[PDB]
């Protein structure tokens, strides 16, 4: 199966605070596995999955040190961006970064990622070629020219194609315990006297991606939502004429399933 790693980094400044607050969260196959937060009493990368305790103190000291550097980087960048956008003193501002790699089922690098957002909006991103930059805003051209001039792309490309892949392999080897499993959904339908409303529930599944469809032909649904125990929930409903209860069937599609479920009101 395919696999992925990401690091999602955020720096926030507020009118009150003197210095911004820096947070970094690492993910493997979309499950959180490490975390740094500068508001913490003793700022450090802490493990977040059980299988990560296997790393000795040199790992944690090293990564922590990188984090302290990123905090420096985000602080300065925030400062420069303020100037670029002619923003004045006395506002909240935020800067966000996503970086990482995608692997195919053969464990080869499918694609690398490296994008930034300012005030929640795309600021600059590294194209799929890991050589050129895309940046919409006129203000963002200043950073584009700077980074093109200095060879920034090559050093991100090296990380994304090397370290990112290399260490993700290692984490997966260590995670041939907790991460192998995907949880199939368990489906059931409920009745409500709206005409009546039929509601197809899907419960206890991982990962979140899932599809629900009523039939017949191709409705009200809610956004997929975490149960809070590592699994997810979703439902889809339709309004139906009273008595015509069995013309309608629900279908559930999920990667854990050997095949799609088919169910109706029992």
């Amino acid at each position: 199966g395919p696999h992925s790693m990401r690091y999602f980094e955020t720096a926030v400044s507020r009118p009150g605070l003197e210095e911004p607050r820096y947070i970094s969260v690492g993910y493997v196959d979309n499950k959180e596995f490490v975390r740094f937060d500068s508001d913490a009493e003793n700022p450090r990368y802490e493990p977040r999955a059980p299988w990560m305790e296997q790393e000795g103190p040199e790992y944690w000291e090293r990564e922590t040190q990188k984090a302290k550097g990123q905090e420096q980087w985000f602080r300065v960048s925030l400062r420069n961006l303020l100037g670029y956008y002619n923003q004045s003193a006395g506002g909240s501002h935020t800067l966000q970064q996503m970086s990482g790699c995608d692997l195919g089922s053969d464990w080869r690098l499918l694609r690398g990622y490296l994008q930034f957002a300012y005030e929640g909006r795309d600021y600059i991103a590294l194209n799929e070629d890991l050589k050129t930059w895309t940046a919409a805003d006129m203000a963002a051209q200043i950073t584009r020219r700077k980074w093109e001039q200095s060879g920034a792309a090559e050093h991100y490309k090296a990380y994304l194609e090397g370290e990112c892949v290399e260490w993700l392999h290692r984490y997966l080897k260590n995670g041939n315990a907790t991460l192998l499993r995907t949880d199939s959904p368990k489906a059931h339908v409920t009745h409500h006297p709206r005409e009546v409303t039929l509601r197809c529930w899907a419960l206890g599944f991982y990962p979140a991606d899932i599809t629900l469809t009523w039939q017949g032909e191709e409705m009200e649904l809610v956004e997929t939502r975490p149960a809070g125990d590592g699994t997810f929930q979703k439902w889809a409903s339709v309004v139906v004429p009273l008595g015509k209860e069995q013309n309608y069937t629900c279908r559930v599609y999920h990667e854990g399933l050997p095949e799609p479920l088919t169910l109706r009101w029992e």
Binding site: G26, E63, K66, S77, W147, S150, Y156, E163
Partner: peptide
């Protein structure tokens, strides 16, 4: 292992 960044914006 986390990336570290080069030129500041």
């Amino acid at each position: 292992k986390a990336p570290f960044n080069f030129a500041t914006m």
